[PDB]
């Protein structure tokens, strides 16, 4: 497990990053599916996309693993407040806070288990 996701809101589960790639979204074809019943009643759930974002680890140019967050949502995926932007991707460092739809709507904290 190279990384772990800590859920900061009810309705979401924690996640241990084992595989090289994870999709987060309402769609059922997502490794991480926003579907906890409790959550489907919160209205914010309605602003999350079918395919909201993904987290993956990839061998970069320097021949070393690198973590990335790639945004695919309609309302936005934010890292430490900053919009990633639809279709765009960005490296994901340890202690990064992930917010959905609204830049302050924290949902996850990303912990890089590579230094640990």
């Amino acid at each position: 497990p190279w990384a772990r996701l800590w859920a900061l809101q009810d309705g979401f589960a924690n996640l241990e990053c084992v595989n090289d790639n994870y999709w987060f979204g309402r769609d059922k074809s997502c490794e991480y599916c926003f579907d906890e019943p409790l959550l489907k009643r919160t209205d914010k759930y309605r602003t999350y996309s079918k395919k909201h974002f993904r987290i993956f680890r990839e061998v970069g140019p320097k021949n070393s693993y690198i973590a990335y967050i790639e945004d695919h949502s309609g309302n936005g995926t934010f890292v430490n407040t900053e919009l990633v932007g639809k279709g765009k991707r960005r490296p994901l460092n340890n202690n990064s806070e992930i917010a959905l739809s609204l830049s302050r709507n924290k949902v996850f904290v990303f912990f890089d288990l590579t230094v640990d």
Partner: peptide, 8 residues
């Protein structure tokens, strides 16, 4: 799945 409520 339902279409996403766009907040803008």
């Amino acid at each position: 799945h339902f279409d996403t409520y766009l907040i803008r």
